[PDB]
Design an enzyme around this catalytic site. Structure first.
Site, PDB file in Angstrom:
ATOM      1  N   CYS A 131     -74.051  17.162  21.724  1.00 20.34           N
ATOM      2  CA  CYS A 131     -73.807  16.626  23.432  1.00 20.34           C
ATOM      3  C   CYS A 131     -74.427  15.588  22.211  1.00 20.34           C
ATOM      4  O   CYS A 131     -73.566  14.024  22.371  1.00 20.34           O
ATOM      5  CB  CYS A 131     -75.496  17.156  23.509  1.00 20.34           C
ATOM      6  SG  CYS A 131     -75.229  15.904  24.828  1.00 20.34           S
TER       7      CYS A 131
ATOM      8  N   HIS B 258     -85.026  16.387  30.868  1.00 19.54           N
ATOM      9  CA  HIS B 258     -84.982  16.549  32.023  1.00 19.54           C
ATOM     10  C   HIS B 258     -85.283  17.654  32.925  1.00 19.54           C
ATOM     11  O   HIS B 258     -85.363  17.034  34.444  1.00 19.54           O
ATOM     12  CB  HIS B 258     -83.694  15.956  32.423  1.00 19.54           C
ATOM     13  CG  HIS B 258     -83.849  13.854  32.115  1.00 19.54           C
ATOM     14  ND1 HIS B 258     -85.080  13.833  32.025  1.00 19.54           N
ATOM     15  CD2 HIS B 258     -82.552  13.578  30.901  1.00 19.54           C
ATOM     16  CE1 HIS B 258     -84.613  11.918  31.656  1.00 19.54           C
ATOM     17  NE2 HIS B 258     -83.092  12.139  31.568  1.00 19.54           N
TER      18      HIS B 258
ATOM     19  N   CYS C  93     -82.423  17.661  23.153  1.00 21.17           N
ATOM     20  CA  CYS C  93     -81.907  16.389  23.960  1.00 21.17           C
ATOM     21  C   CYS C  93     -83.066  15.988  25.120  1.00 21.17           C
ATOM     22  O   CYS C  93     -83.150  17.150  26.019  1.00 21.17           O
ATOM     23  CB  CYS C  93     -80.299  16.497  25.038  1.00 21.17           C
ATOM     24  SG  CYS C  93     -79.482  15.242  25.560  1.00 21.17           S
TER      25      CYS C  93
ATOM     26  N   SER D  42     -82.275  15.531  28.060  1.00 25.71           N
ATOM     27  CA  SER D  42     -81.496  15.656  28.809  1.00 25.71           C
ATOM     28  C   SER D  42     -82.265  17.460  29.617  1.00 25.71           C
ATOM     29  O   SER D  42     -82.696  18.254  30.419  1.00 25.71           O
ATOM     30  CB  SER D  42     -79.748  16.190  29.303  1.00 25.71           C
ATOM     31  OG  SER D  42     -79.297  14.114  28.931  1.00 25.71           O
TER      32      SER D  42
ATOM     33  N   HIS E 274     -78.446  23.040  25.423  1.00 23.61           N
ATOM     34  CA  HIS E 274     -76.708  22.228  26.014  1.00 23.61           C
ATOM     35  C   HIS E 274     -76.318  22.040  24.775  1.00 23.61           C
ATOM     36  O   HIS E 274     -75.304  21.955  24.863  1.00 23.61           O
ATOM     37  CB  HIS E 274     -76.706  21.702  26.893  1.00 23.61           C
ATOM     38  CG  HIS E 274     -77.309  20.847  26.978  1.00 23.61           C
ATOM     39  ND1 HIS E 274     -78.658  20.498  27.216  1.00 23.61           N
ATOM     40  CD2 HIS E 274     -76.581  18.983  26.467  1.00 23.61           C
ATOM     41  CE1 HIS E 274     -78.826  18.876  27.102  1.00 23.61           C
ATOM     42  NE2 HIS E 274     -77.467  18.232  26.416  1.00 23.61           N
TER      43      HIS E 274
HETATM   44  N1  LIG Z   1     -74.025  11.503  29.734  1.00 28.05           N
HETATM   45  C1  LIG Z   1     -74.313  11.611  28.845  1.00 28.05           C
HETATM   46  O1  LIG Z   1     -73.516  12.789  28.801  1.00 28.05           O
HETATM   47  C2  LIG Z   1     -75.460  12.083  28.209  1.00 28.05           C
HETATM   48  C3  LIG Z   1     -75.608  13.264  26.900  1.00 28.05           C
HETATM   49  C4  LIG Z   1     -77.105  12.471  26.443  1.00 28.05           C
HETATM   50  C5  LIG Z   1     -77.808  12.193  27.147  1.00 28.05           C
HETATM   51  N2  LIG Z   1     -78.117  11.824  28.359  1.00 28.05           N
HETATM   52  C6  LIG Z   1     -79.091  11.208  28.256  1.00 28.05           C
HETATM   53  O2  LIG Z   1     -79.291   9.337  27.776  1.00 28.05           O
HETATM   54  C7  LIG Z   1     -80.323   9.595  27.945  1.00 28.05           C
HETATM   55  C8  LIG Z   1     -81.406   9.082  26.351  1.00 28.05           C
HETATM   56  O3  LIG Z   1     -81.422  10.790  25.758  1.00 28.05           O
HETATM   57  P1  LIG Z   1     -81.811  10.622  24.407  1.00 28.05           P
HETATM   58  O4  LIG Z   1     -81.487   9.406  23.497  1.00 28.05           O
HETATM   59  O5  LIG Z   1     -81.588  11.869  24.471  1.00 28.05           O
HETATM   60  O6  LIG Z   1     -83.170  10.530  25.267  1.00 28.05           O
HETATM   61  P2  LIG Z   1     -84.269   9.632  24.329  1.00 28.05           P
HETATM   62  O7  LIG Z   1     -84.822  10.334  22.968  1.00 28.05           O
HETATM   63  O8  LIG Z   1     -85.983  10.126  25.160  1.00 28.05           O
HETATM   64  O9  LIG Z   1     -84.697   7.846  24.507  1.00 28.05           O
HETATM   65  C9  LIG Z   1     -84.119   7.361  24.837  1.00 28.05           C
HETATM   66  C10 LIG Z   1     -84.666   5.846  24.855  1.00 28.05           C
HETATM   67  O10 LIG Z   1     -85.106   4.859  25.746  1.00 28.05           O
HETATM   68  C11 LIG Z   1     -86.893   4.373  25.961  1.00 28.05           C
HETATM   69  N3  LIG Z   1     -87.101   4.033  26.430  1.00 28.05           N
HETATM   70  C12 LIG Z   1     -87.562   4.181  27.918  1.00 28.05           C
HETATM   71  N4  LIG Z   1     -88.009   3.166  28.331  1.00 28.05           N
HETATM   72  C13 LIG Z   1     -87.362   2.092  28.099  1.00 28.05           C
HETATM   73  C14 LIG Z   1     -86.901   0.745  28.476  1.00 28.05           C
HETATM   74  N5  LIG Z   1     -87.955   0.721  30.392  1.00 28.05           N
HETATM   75  N6  LIG Z   1     -86.549  -0.213  28.093  1.00 28.05           N
HETATM   76  C15 LIG Z   1     -86.274   0.382  26.907  1.00 28.05           C
HETATM   77  N7  LIG Z   1     -85.881   1.233  26.199  1.00 28.05           N
HETATM   78  C16 LIG Z   1     -86.552   2.374  26.865  1.00 28.05           C
HETATM   79  C17 LIG Z   1     -87.687   5.477  24.374  1.00 28.05           C
HETATM   80  O11 LIG Z   1     -88.619   3.792  23.812  1.00 28.05           O
HETATM   81  C18 LIG Z   1     -86.496   6.417  23.966  1.00 28.05           C
HETATM   82  O12 LIG Z   1     -86.577   5.795  22.630  1.00 28.05           O
HETATM   83  C19 LIG Z   1     -81.096  10.711  28.598  1.00 28.05           C
HETATM   84  O13 LIG Z   1     -81.428  10.057  29.805  1.00 28.05           O
HETATM   85  C20 LIG Z   1     -80.074  11.228  28.883  1.00 28.05           C
HETATM   86  O14 LIG Z   1     -80.406  12.530  29.965  1.00 28.05           O
HETATM   87  C21 LIG Z   1     -76.222  11.497  28.437  1.00 28.05           C
HETATM   88 ZN   LIG Z   2     -77.448  15.325  25.710  1.00 28.08          ZN
END
Ligand SMILES: NC(=O)c1ccc[n+]([C@@H]2O[C@H](COP(=O)([O-])OP(=O)([O-])OC[C@H]3O[C@@H](n4cnc5c(N)[nH+]cnc54)[C@H](O)[C@@H]3O)[C@@H](O)[C@H]2O)c1
Ligand SMILES: [Zn+2]
Ligand SMILES: NC(=O)c1ccc[n+]([C@@H]2O[C@H](COP(=O)([O-])OP(=O)([O-])OC[C@H]3O[C@@H](n4cnc5c(N)[nH+]cnc54)[C@H](O)[C@@H]3O)[C@@H](O)[C@H]2O)c1
Ligand SMILES: [Zn+2]
Ligand SMILES: [Zn+2]
Ligand SMILES: [Zn+2]
Lengths: 374, 374
Positions: free
Chosen positions: B174, B51, B46, B48, B67
Site C-alpha cells: 500500500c 479510517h 496504514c 486507511s 490491507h
Molecule cells: N489513494 C490511495 O490508494 C491511498 C493509499 C494509502 C493511503 N491513502 C490515504 O492517504 C492519506 C495518508 O495516509 P498515511 O500517510 O498513511 O497517513 P498519516 O501517517 O496519518 O499521514 C497524514 C499526515 O497528514 C498530516 N496532516 C493532518 N492534517 C493536516 C493539515 N491540515 N495540513 C497538513 N498536514 C496535515 C499529519 O500530521 C500526518 O503527518 C490517508 O487519508 C489515507 O487513507 C490513500
Molecule cells: Zn493503505
C-alpha cells in the site's frame, strides 16, 4: 488619412448590465508604442460576450465588448515588428507575451498578461484608447472588437494569410479554436474513443469537429434544445440526447450508453451542475473531463472527491490550450488548406448595426454563430 | 497439514467503530475455487485502516481490517494458476482481474472487481471466509491482513521473489507504491520541477521519494506536525512549511514561494480543505494536483471551477495508478536491486498482538509505519 490621428467611428457600447448595446460614435486614440490599431472587418457573437451583458462574466463597464474577430491593420505604434499597415489580423483575447513562465512552458497558454483572471478593462499600460460622449470606455480582454476600429497591444494580435476570408476566419479568434483545441490538445481525444459533449452551440460543435478529427468512434451530443441536434450530427455526433427526455439523471444515462462511462467528456455550457455531471459521466478509472464553459461569477460547485480518487482527470482551458500568437496563423493556414470547415458554425450574417438582433438570435436558441460585418 | 481444513487462528476483529481491536480466535475456511489462503508474516498499519475505526472509510462491521501485508501461501483452491503453496505473496487491495475494461486500458488500474467504491466486505462470491464467536465477520478490500491467516481471491494476490524480506516489502502492498506511483506514474513529475506534498506520513514520504526519483528541483513538504519535517528532508524534501506558522493561507504562501505556483501538488492527508488548497497552489495555467488522501465518507468539497478553466489539471488515484498484479512483483524486484528504500518509512516494529499500541502510535503522531510481525 488616419495614422497618428484620433479616429471617430461607430462602436457598440455597453453602458450597464442587462441593456441593449448602444451603437454610436466613439473616439479611438492612435496606437502608442507596441500597440496596433485595426479596422474591423467581421466579428462573431460568442456566448462570452453575452455573459458580459448578463453579469455572468464580470468586467468593468462601460465597455466595448467583442473578442472573436478579424480585421486589417490601419496603423502601428513605435516598436511594433510583427504586423504592418494593411495586414490581415486576428486579435488575441488570450495574449502571448513570449516572456512569462506560462508562455515559456511547453503546455501553458494562459499568458500572465491576460485580462481574464482579474479584469481591468484597459490596454497593457493601464489606460484606455476609447472615449464616448466625453467618458472613458473600457476595453474587453485586450480586444474590444464591437467597433469599426480598435487598438490592441502587439502581444494581443496575430498576422494571418493575406488571402484569408475574414468573414469566416474570425471564428478562429474564439469559438472554433476553443472547441477544436479542447478536444485535440487539452483532452487529447484518442482514436476509437467515446466522447460526450455538453452544449451544442458554436463552441460545442467545434469540440465535436475535434473529436471526429481525432478519430473518436462515438460522439454523444447533449443539449436541452433538440433543435441543435441536426447540426451536431452533420459535424460528427453519432447520437444526441436531451436530459429533459429522461427520468434518470443524464450522467446515469451516459454511463449506461457507454457501458460504464465515456473516455472524454466536455462541459461547453457554463453551468456548475453540468460541470459535475460531465465529470461523473466519464469512466471512473481513466476518464477525462474538460471544462470549457465560463462559470457564473464567484459561484462554487459541490462535488464528491471520490470521483477523482478512483482515477478521473478533470481539467479546463482557455482558448483550447493554444498558444495564441503561434497558433492562430497556423489554424488560418490549415483552414485555407481545407483541413477543417467553418461554414457549419455560421447560421446568420448581419451588418454590425444589427448587433442587438444578433444577440437576440443567440438568446432565443435560434443561432449558432452570427457574424457581424462592418 | 491444514489443506482443505478450517484453520483456527488469532485475528484482530473490529466489532464496533471507535474501539480497540479485539485479538481473538477466528475460524478461517479453506479456499474455494480461484481462492488462496495465506499465512501472514508482516502487515503495516496504514491510516486507511484507522479510517475504518474512525468511520472515515465506511465498510461493513464487524470486520477484519488490514490491507498492507506480505505472507506465504498455505493452500490454493481449485483452478488457481498464479501462486502455489510456499510462495511469498502480497495481497492486492486493488485487484487486477485482467478482463474488465479498466484492466484492459493502458492507463487504468482501478479494476471493476474492487471492494473500495461500494464496500460489501466479502469475497468476490459475496460470502465470508471468517467466523468469530460463531458469527460471520466481514472482509476488508478483499485482503483482511490483520489475521494470522486470510483467504483472498486469486485476482487479489501477487507472487513475489522467494528471497523477499517480507517485514519490509509489505509496504509495497500500500503506502510505498501509492505514494511513489502518485508521483512517477499519475502526476508524471518532471526533471527540474517544483512539487508540494501535503501530509508527511508514510504515503507522503513515498510521494517525496518519487518526486526526487523523477528529478524534481524543489520538493516542499507541508505538515501541521513539525516533528515530521526531519524525515521528509532525509528522503528528499528541500524545505518544509507548517501552515500554522503563517498568517496567510498556505496556498498563497506556496504560490509566493514558487514564484507563481508549483508544477505538481499532492494531497496526502484526506481533508476536503487541503484538497482545494493543494489544487489552488499549483500554477493556474499548467499545474497538476493529485488527490491521494481518502476523504471522509459521503462529504462533498466546494470549489471555484475557474481554478480549472485557467488550465489546471486535477486528478486522483488508488494505489499510485499501478496495475496491481503486474506491478507489485516488479516493485519487489526493484527493491531487491536497491532502486528505492523502505527503511525510512519504518519507525516502529511490534508483534501483531500489540496492534492496538501500533494504532496508538499512529494516532499520537509519533509513527510513520509500524510493521506488525505474526
Ligand atoms: N489513494 C490511495 O490508494 C491511498 C493509499 C494509502 C493511503 N491513502 C490515504 O492517504 C492519506 C495518508 O495516509 P498515511 O500517510 O498513511 O497517513 P498519516 O501517517 O496519518 O499521514 C497524514 C499526515 O497528514 C498530516 N496532516 C493532518 N492534517 C493536516 C493539515 N491540515 N495540513 C497538513 N498536514 C496535515 C499529519 O500530521 C500526518 O503527518 C490517508 O487519508 C489515507 O487513507 C490513500
Ligand atoms: Zn493503505
Ligand atoms: N474556455 C474558453 O476559452 C471559452 C471560449 C468560448 C466560449 N466559452 C464558453 O463556452 C460556453 C459555450 O459558448 P457558446 O458555444 O458560444 O454558447 P451557446 O451557443 O449559448 O451554446 C450553449 C449550448 O448549451 C445548451 N445548454 C444550455 N443549458 C443546458 C443544459 N442544462 N444542459 C445541456 N445543454 C444546455 C444550449 O441550449 C446551447 O445550445 C459559454 O459559457 C462560453 O462563455 C469559453
Ligand atoms: Zn506570457
Ligand atoms: Zn469567446
Ligand atoms: Zn479488472
Amino acid at each position: 488619412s488616419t495614422a497618428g490621428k484620433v479616429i471617430k467611428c461607430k462602436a457598440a457600447v455597453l453602458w450597464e448590465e442587462k441593456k441593449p448595446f448602444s451603437i454610436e460614435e466613439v473616439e479611438v486614440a492612435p496606437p502608442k508604442a507596441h500597440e496596433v490599431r485595426i479596422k474591423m472587418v467581421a466579428t462573431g457573437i460568442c456566448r462570452s460576450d453575452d455573459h458580459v451583458v448578463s453579469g455572468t462574466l464580470v468586467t468593468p463597464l462601460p465597455v466595448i465588448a467583442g473578442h472573436e474577430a478579424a480585421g486589417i491593420v490601419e496603423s502601428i505604434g513605435e516598436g511594433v515588428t510583427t504586423v504592418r499597415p494593411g495586414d490581415k489580423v486576428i486579435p488575441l483575447f488570450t495574449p502571448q507575451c513570449g516572456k512569462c513562465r506560462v508562455c515559456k512552458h511547453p503546455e501553458g497558454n494562459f499568458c500572465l498578461k491576460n485580462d481574464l483572471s482579474m479584469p481591468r478593462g484597459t490596454m497593457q499600460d493601464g489606460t484606455s484608447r476609447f472615449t464616448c460622449r466625453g467618458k472613458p470606455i473600457h476595453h474587453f480582454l485586450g480586444t474590444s472588437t464591437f467597433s469599426q476600429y480598435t487598438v490592441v497591444d502587439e502581444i494581443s494580435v496575430a498576422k494571418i494569410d493575406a488571402a484569408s476570408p475574414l468573414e469566416k476566419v474570425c471564428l478562429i479568434g474564439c469559438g472554433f479554436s476553443t472547441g477544436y483545441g479542447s478536444a485535440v490538445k487539452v483532452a487529447k481525444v484518442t482514436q476509437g474513443s467515446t466522447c460526450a459533449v455538453f452544449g451544442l452551440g458554436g463552441v460545442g460543435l467545434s469540440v465535436i469537429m475535434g473529436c471526429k478529427a481525432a478519430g473518436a468512434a462515438r460522439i454523444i451530443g447533449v443539449d436541452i434544445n433538440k433543435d441543435k441536434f441536426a447540426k451536431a450530427k452533420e459535424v460528427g455526433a453519432t447520437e444526441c440526447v436531451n436530459p429533459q427526455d429522461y427520468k434518470k439523471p443524464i450522467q446515469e444515462v451516459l454511463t449506461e450508453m457507454s457501458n460504464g462511462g465515456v473516455d472524454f467528456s466536455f462541459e461547453v455550457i457554463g453551468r456548475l451542475d453540468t460541470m459535475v455531471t460531465a465529470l461523473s459521466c466519464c469512466q471512473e478509472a481513466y476518464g477525462v473531463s474538460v471544462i470549457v464553459g465560463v462559470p457564473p461569477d464567484s459561484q462554487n460547485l459541490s462535488m464528491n472527491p471520490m470521483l477523482l480518487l478512483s482515477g478521473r482527470t478533470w481539467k479546463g482551458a482557455i482558448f483550447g490550450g493554444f498558444k495564441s500568437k503561434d497558433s492562430v496563423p497556423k489554424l488560418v493556414a490549415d483552414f485555407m488548406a481545407k483541413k477543417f470547415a467553418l461554414d457549419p458554425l455560421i447560421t446568420h450574417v448581419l451588418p454590425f448595426e444589427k448587433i442587438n438582433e444578433g444577440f437576440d438570435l443567440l438568446r432565443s436558441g435560434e443561432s449558432i454563430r452570427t457574424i457581424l460585418t462592418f
